[PDB]
Design a protein around this ligand. Structure first.
Ligand code: KDT
Ligand code: KDT
Ligand code: KDT
Ligand code: KDT
Ligand code: CL
Ligand code: CL
Ligand code: CL
Ligand code: CL
Lengths: 296, 292, 292, 296
């Protein structure tokens, strides 16, 4: 039968019991990093990549809290839809849950607990999303590559293997929780078998693209900060890091209102209304300052 | 016998958007939910029957977190504050819970630390008549109830958020009352800023010579949770203590255990669901380590 | 009468390159030089005659920083440790300074904080015979002198950096001795790792039943300065206390002032050269504020 | 009479009494930021700009400590010379003190207490130093522009005024403590008169270049961190910021040995020797890892 843009997914489900009891009353991706909820950072990340149709995947328990926080996205020039993940059966599951949302479009997956910062981050995202076929991932040098998907490179910089949490990592380059995919991903994810843990592995997805000669791995250099939210200690460092940048600059990191404003998905009048309910705190005052300041 | 209340109500829009999705006192300070700290404080004071007051939206979540308390040897109840009309409203909402008993109120977002905290709370809770509060030296007393002392160290006035504070001594968020507080609370009128003021309660006792203001010395940490920057500093402070010591601040299960409100067997069971993380490992280690 | 020693000697190459240019105990923890903290500790213990031992390179700089002590009502002297041959060498270098008197040793990079620290030090310094030390629960006891206690709480062994620690109780860097320590130090032989061990001194008193090990409870902060990460945590801990309180930890001038070793007029003069910064402003405010 | 590259200056003199008593025993620029002395960061910054001949200006009291720390630079492929600043008479004084060092060459001034971090920092420095005439400065958005030299821009992005610590800043763009100059600077600095404070102002120097149509002002964007070392509080945040980046990555910020190595001012054998004396700590172990790791 005859036939004739990129959608975003934020996976913000269960971190199981790993951070209990801190996370007994709410999901991790609603905990604040400094002044804003965690999910603002990966959300702003998708927005920075130019993505406006976004699916937020969470637990059944917490979907209402995400919905209360973010609405349908139309205040920030977005359309946000919602899906639930009954059981934390792995990251690749986002594509089965997100199958009808994705449709026949390209996609991007971002972990709902991943924080990024740096210069020309916009352009780094822009190059990944412009690649219309294949998958694109980012490799970041870390102290503890054993905890991550690890990329092995040959002498000419070419990616030649991927291993999920190897005990003896071939390099210190970890695959970050930000992923760009073409229209082949749903089918790749549908045919995965659970790993020995009992999860549908994103690293198997990425390996399938690697075996087709269609995985781009770009370096996210050391001049970027890819922050750890894995532990209570790392969470605290993430808050301190953002607080230090924000107090130094009088500018915010991953303020979604700002990113919409600079993308011109919202205008001055719209942003002025969003500042009204928050006028008596620093966040609404910050939104108001953005209306009459040129920031390069 | 003394009953406890934790007022863990709404902090307006002051910390939005971080508190949009959920109330402050369910956010963590480092490894545990903020409310673990004031709950632990009441438990250290020997108080086992405790009323938790939160917004109507968040009461299910406090309930889900803490249950009826029986697993930690407590008897928890729950009640709602529909609107943030002032801290003294705790005694009106809590009137039937209190009954004819002595009471203590702690604010749901106040963190305490220090040597002999147990005996400081115990000397306040043993005082069967009158009211006991604590005064603590702060940088910014305008934000609090401010105690003025005469040259003999005797408290002579209390002012709520004065524009010109008389000293740097702030009343902490921890209050012990006798059987008169309910009746004093019932007679309160709203202040200029629309609230039933805990400070007017304390002023009623001060006017009868019945307010014991004890100094919480500079060797105690009373931590600030009122701003994003201070919520952060507190996490860092707790983390530095717990990583130095291999011991936890305000772990309710440990406090129950050392009060002997639960025995070894029950603590073992509590450590089971969390066995794979540090928090349950910590509980397990408490069974066979002597900590002075 | 009891004399003090601060051992502020070399920490090898362990923290290089940060300590290449200058010794650790002249680096700041937040607003003040590390040594202000242990010096303040000795002063809180009532000790006014104090010997500062540093490397030969850095003694001029300790001298330049602190002078003879007379401006703060102290009597400071100085001596050198040519090589880091162990903490017990303090008593050999310090032999003639000590004379026939009681002594206390504090390590130059140890930070203490807590309620009733004054009375904890005072009960140790009042014990005119034997030796008093403090045991503190830590995560990593292998790094320290480790106390083992029997079931009655009585100390029964000390091991320096054991591979298999018997408890989590570390001996802190703060030691009170009677008139026997010099003679015990003189008889020490170097350990396998080439040092005159403070732990062998304490073991000599333990074998005579003369070692008082008191618990420094979990409500005290004994902060770690041994790593870059811990030096940082300490700055953050001090900063959080001082910014919350508008009061300083281990300001020597305040301690002198409250001991009444200097009077109002002398404190005023001390606040003059620093008047344009917070540290001198702080000193000036101490003249006309009552702090309990 | 007939005639026929860029030198660096680090100003690391007195911060007066402002941080006393912390700075009573040593100068500020020898205090560590996390694991390394402060002066390593601006030094590495000059090295990143490709500058190998560098003059360190300090107090007479502390010149030996700087010399003990850094030597003559030949271990790191540099030549380091030393000068003293008897009295803290302003930043522009570096050019009178440095006059014979500079000679007839181009120059760069960096404050000895300035910390920078970000992606493509190398390329940002490269563009400033390639400009062979005029001066080049960097403008950075900050919360407290009143404390700094402030750049005013017109509607087309063009710099039109500079004011030193204005009470009512025309923008939030502060001039950073990193400056590139052509051969005119010594003469400009010689003819300055002290300000009402009694200092030779770097902002007057920069204004003189602006009045000649020869000041380039480039934006150092918000994706860079220009950290504050002005206060005990900011110092502590600077240490936390570096510690968080370093523990996350297993890579160092402004390790001078590394920068020399990557510039190829030193070779593998030379770097191996520099690791020998530090082998039992993390810093020497880090130098050793750099010998057999490819880091992009
Ligand atoms: C610091 N960054 C940042 C930047 N650069 N910007 C400016 C910006 C926003 C949108 C566009 Br279109 C181009 C520039 C912003 O408004 N908020 C930001 O957080 S970032 O590009 O590194 C970043 C963006 C989104 C999430 C996390 C980091
Ligand atoms: C550090 N403190 C503390 C202490 N002291 N203890 C020991 C202890 C617990 C219960 C009892 Br009856 C006696 C001693 C504990 O198990 N957990 C603690 O967090 S504390 O008394 O300052 C404290 C207790 C509760 C909440 C906040 C601080
Ligand atoms: C916070 N502490 C402290 C206290 N408590 N005081 C008050 C004080 C000082 C001297 C005396 Br005689 C009695 C009380 C002070 O002036 N400075 C302090 O730093 S402390 O006793 O825990 C302490 C003292 C000295 C070094 C480190 C901590
Ligand atoms: C994080 N940065 C950094 C980087 N990028 N590098 C890598 C690098 C070093 C030299 C060259 Br030629 C090209 C790349 C490094 O070895 N150490 C560094 O600190 S940086 O460019 O932002 C920087 C360099 C020097 C001082 C402060 C920051
Ligand atoms: Cl980079
Ligand atoms: Cl105290
Ligand atoms: Cl204690
Ligand atoms: Cl940028």
């Amino acid at each position: 039968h005859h036939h004739h843009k990129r959608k975003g997914i934020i996976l913000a489900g269960g971190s199981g019991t790993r951070l209990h009891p801190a996370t007994l009353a709410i999901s991790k991706q609603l905990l604040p990093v400094y002044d804003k909820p965690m999910i603002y950072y990966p959300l702003s990340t998708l927005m920075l990549a130019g993505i406006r149709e976004i699916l937020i995947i969470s637990t059944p328990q917490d979907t209402p809290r995400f919905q209360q926080l973010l609405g349908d996205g139309s205040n920030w020039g977005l359309d946000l839809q919602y899906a639930v993940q009954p059981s934390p059966d792995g990251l690749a599951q986002a594509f089965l849950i997100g199958e009808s949302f994705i449709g026949n479009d390209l996609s991007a997956l971002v972990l709902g607990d991943n924080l990024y910062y740096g210069h020309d981050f916009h352009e780094l995202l822009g190059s990944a999303s412009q690649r219309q076929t294949g998958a694109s991932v980012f490799a970041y040098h870390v102290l503890d590559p054993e905890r991550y998907g690890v990329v092995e490179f040959d002498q000419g910089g070419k990616a030649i293997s991927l291993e999920e949490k190897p005990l003896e990592p071939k390099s210190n380059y970890a695959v970050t929780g930000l992923y760009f995919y073409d229209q082949q991903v749903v089918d790749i994810a549908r045919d995965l078998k659970p790993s020995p843990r009992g999860e549908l592995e994103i690293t198997d997805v990425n390996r399938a693209y690697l075996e087709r000669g269609q995985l781009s791995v770009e370096i996210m250099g050391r001049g970027y900060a890819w922050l750890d939210t894995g532990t209570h200690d790392s969470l605290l460092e993430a808050g301190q890091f953002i607080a230090t940048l924000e107090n130094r600059q009088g500018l915010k990191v991953a303020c979604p209102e700002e990113i919409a404003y600079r993308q011109k998905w919202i205008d001055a009048a719209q942003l002025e209304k969003l500042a009204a309910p928050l006028a008596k705190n620093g966040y609404g005052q910050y939104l108001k300052r953005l209306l009459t300041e040129t920031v390069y």
